[PDB]
């Protein structure tokens, strides 16, 4: 599920105007157009902090990883994070995030919250999750084994603890196997992560046609703001000046209107990505095809850039 | 060279700063233009010489202020742009007040070690807030306490103790 | 409509360069002599003043100004009897090397065709809703409601 | 001021807590570089203007003067002539 | 704003130019006029559609928290549910978990 | 339940022009905005399958 996006802002003296006197005393003539344009690209990046604020951390309370490690006999070292690496990445997040791929008056805000921060976010829940149990959102921590946590969350799904403790040496041959295919699917592939492809594309797609807007003449003889001024009769030149500011204001209408419905359709996925992170990992769903296919026992969540992957 | 100048070559004019090109171009070539129906190469009629043309004036301005009610200080966000080089106030380009960050530099505003729960975000992982003869600090935002919690085979706790807490929701 | 002055510029003008009075024009008058910026509110009036404004023997009166050594701002009259000076030689307010006395005589006879034909410009200058305006035509006036 | 910076694009007198856009850096040109191509040579205006005989309505004579610099001072400091009719390009602008 | 016009008043426009000539200066300040009310359909029928939402989620806690027993985590509050009451707000809902 | 919408292709030419000679010249002029209308209406067609 893709949680946040590329925040941009848009000057209005740079991309309107080709730094010149006659094109920005004739701005002030049209006032408050690029003002609400401005502030509407100011209302998305607003938003676009709080998409990361209500799924990556869900509790205010960071819990680490003791260092002596067996838990059930499984290998949970592949959704840990790597301590001898000066960056917090797990083996799996080593393959997020490599998967995924000027002025003129754009530019490019930086998000608030760091990716190295996300994986802190990433590894803290993943301590509630295998070692706390289902409580560390509902409250205080508890402190429950991995023996006894599998047998109440078989029993949320009708099934009691006689599967469980006979054949606990039969699931370390298929919970590490199932774990190693996904491993191996992300790295050879990188089509599974193209959503979150799609989210760079969308932004990449829409500041390059945005820049081709100027080569086209609008109406106007030449495109050049300093070839009317110096051609032109000064009754002439405010004619086709303001044809060109007339279009270059309808293609950055086209661009903000275009955003703010990419912004409506990413919130409703981070709020779907904040439900999955309530319901699927701080705790266990009876329902059929949301914690994903067939019952629920857990759920992982991993970092990615510009949203999140979780492992059902 | 190296200045930022008004342009005016052949009737065409701009504004922006001369630098070498060190790209192969025509014999017979006049001008060159970019991505847009902008340029970049010039020649030089009297002696031959193509140099690049780069534009001046990038880079938006920030303020981080608190209230009207509460202080003046205003702490001044440059954004994007390389501040070794550096509104029409100069008085903060003395220096000492200055800390580099990825998303620029933040001048009037000294970085603290401590690690606090802010209110006004900047970017990048700094934060920002107005703390303790008071003036406004930056620092990274934190995460929360630190629970340290041991794990063993056999350990379980119980909770003894109950409350009821409402919470509101809008 | 209601304006509160008018400056009235009475000048004659050879009958060739009497279409020249508009905003945005080059010429001799249209450059060093008298500009229209393009902001100016009012009319132009002229007038054919050959049948009482020539003489037989030519017209000495009226004299102009061919020659000053930029552009002239609107609105100004330039008395200045100084001799143009084209190169480093001066002029000492002769004629001589690089020196042209930069006053001039019409040409008017009644006689010739018709850009040697006088025509009287007066050019009204409106200035509206600047200040209080006093002055319009004969419009009546009814009680308040 | 930056207080008062603030207040010009907000266009409030009372300042919220928050971080706020303002304006964008302004680098004013001091000097101008115009090149030009040097040519001592002067155009041959006074050739085709001054001559006793022209050509006809329905044949021509097309001159084309090239290589040189143009001399504008007889159109545009003086005006013996007739029509002046100009349309593309403004003709306080021909010698820029 | 004026539009590119020398007037923004309708009224002056007609007081003054040509009629050939006043018809060029009101269909710049209409184009004017039509593009802030273009942006008064686009804004506010996104803002329809963010309230569209928020109030499907309304009224899906009315139905599970309100009126049922939901044994989901952070959606009826933090904690197990019991009960909640709602309370009415000037354009919008109160709900006390 | 509503599920999907009716999908709906709009082109450039016949709906701005009367297909003659002189409206697909001066169509050149404004450039790559029949580009976005196009790639507008097809992310909608893929999106209601």
């Known amino acids: 599920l893709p949680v946040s996006m590329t925040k941009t802002s848009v000057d209005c003296t740079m991309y309107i105007c080709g730094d010149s006197t006659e094109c920005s005393n004739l701005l002030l003539q049209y006032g408050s157009f690029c003002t609400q344009l401005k502030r509407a690209l100011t209302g998305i990046a607003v938003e676009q902090d709080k998409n ?5 951390a869900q509790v205010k309370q960071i819990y680490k990883t003791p260092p002596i490690k067996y838990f059930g006999g499984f290998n949970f070292s592949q959704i840990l994070p790597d301590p001898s690496k000066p960056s917090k990445r797990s083996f799996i997040e080593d393959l997020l995030f490599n998967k995924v791929t000027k002025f003129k008056g754009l530019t490019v805000l930086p998000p608030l919250l760091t990716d190295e921060m996300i994986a802190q976010y990433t590894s803290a829940l993943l301590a509630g999750t295998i070692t706390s149990g289902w409580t560390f959102g509902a409250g205080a921590a ?45 790295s050879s592939t990188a089509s ?39 051609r032109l009769d000064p009754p002439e030149a405010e004619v086709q000046i303001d044809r060109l500011i007339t279009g270059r204001l309808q293609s950055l209408q086209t661009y903000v209107t275009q955003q703010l419905i990419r912004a409506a359709e990413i919130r409703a996925s981070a709020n779907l990505a904040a439900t999955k992170m309530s319901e699927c990992v701080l705790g266990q769903s009876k329902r059929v095809d949301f914690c994903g296919k067939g019952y629920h026992l857990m759920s992982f969540p991993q970092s990615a850039p510009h949203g999140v992957v979780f492992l059902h | 060279k190296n200045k930022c100048v008004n342009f005016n070559f052949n009737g065409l004019k701009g504004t922006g700063v001369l630098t070498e090109s060190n790209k192969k171009f025509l014999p017979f070539q006049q001008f060159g233009r970019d991505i847009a129906d902008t340029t970049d190469a010039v020649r030089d009629p009297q002696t031959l010489e193509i140099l690049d043309i780069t534009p001046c004036s990038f880079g938006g301005v920030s303020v981080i202020t608190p209230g009207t009610n509460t202080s003046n200080q205003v702490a001044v966000l440059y954004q994007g742009v390389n501040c070794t080089e550096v509104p029409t106030w100069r008085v903060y380009s003395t220096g000492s007040n200055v800390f580099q960050t990825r998303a620029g530099c933040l001048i009037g505003a000294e970085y603290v070690n401590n690690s606090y729960e802010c209110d006004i975000p900047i970017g990048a992982g700094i934060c920002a807030s107005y703390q303790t003869s008071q003036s406004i600090i930056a620092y990274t935002m934190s995460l929360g306490a630190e629970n340290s919690v041991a794990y063993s085979n056999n350990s379980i706790a119980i909770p003894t103790n109950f409350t009821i807490s409402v919470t509101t929701e809008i | 409509l209601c304006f509160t002055n008018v400056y009235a510029d009475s000048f004659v003008i050879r009958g060739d360069e009497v279409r020249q009075i508009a905003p945005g024009q080059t010429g001799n008058i249209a450059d060093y002599n008298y500009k229209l910026p393009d902001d100016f509110t009012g009319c132009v009036i002229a007038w054919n003043s050959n049948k009482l404004d020539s003489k037989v023997s030519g017209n000495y009166n009226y004299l102009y100004r061919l020659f000053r050594k930029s552009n002239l701002k609107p609105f100004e009259r330039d008395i200045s009897t100084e001799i143009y000076q084209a190169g480093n030689k001066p002029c000492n307010g002769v004629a001589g090397f690089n020196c042209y006395f930069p006053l001039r005589s019409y040409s008017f006879r009644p006689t010739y065709g018709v850009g040697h034909q006088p025509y009287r410009v007066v050019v009204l200058s409106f200035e509206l809703l600047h200040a209080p305006a006093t002055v319009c035509g004969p419009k009546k006036s009814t009680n308040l409601v | 001021d930056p207080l008062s910076e603030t207040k010009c694009t907000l266009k409030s007198f009372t ?33 085709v203007f001054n001559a006793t005989r022209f050509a006809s309505v329905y044949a021509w004579n097309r001159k084309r003067i090239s290589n040189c610099v143009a001399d504008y001072s007889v159109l545009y400091n003086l005006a013996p002539f007739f029509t002046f009719k100009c349309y593309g390009v403004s003709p306080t602008k021909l010698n820029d």
């Open chain 1, 52 to 56: 990361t604020q209500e799924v990556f």
């Open chain 1, 142 to 186: 508890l402190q429950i084994p991995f023996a006894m946590q599998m047998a109440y969350r078989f029993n949320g799904i009708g099934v009691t603890q006689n599967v469980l403790y006979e054949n606990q040496k039969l699931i370390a041959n298929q919970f590490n196997s199932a774990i190693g295919k996904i491993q191996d699917s992300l």
């Open chain 1, 192 to 230: 599974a992560l193209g959503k979150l492809q799609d989210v760079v594309n969308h932004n990449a797609q829409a500041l390059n046609t945005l820049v081709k807007q100027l080569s086209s003449k609008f109406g106007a003889i030449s495109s050049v703001l300093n070839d009317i001024f110096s």
């Open chain 4, 15 to 47: 300042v919220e807590k928050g971080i706020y856009q303002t304006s964008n850096f302004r680098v004013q040109p001091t000097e101008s570089i115009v090149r030009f191509p040097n040519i001592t040579n002067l155009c041959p205006f006074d050739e």
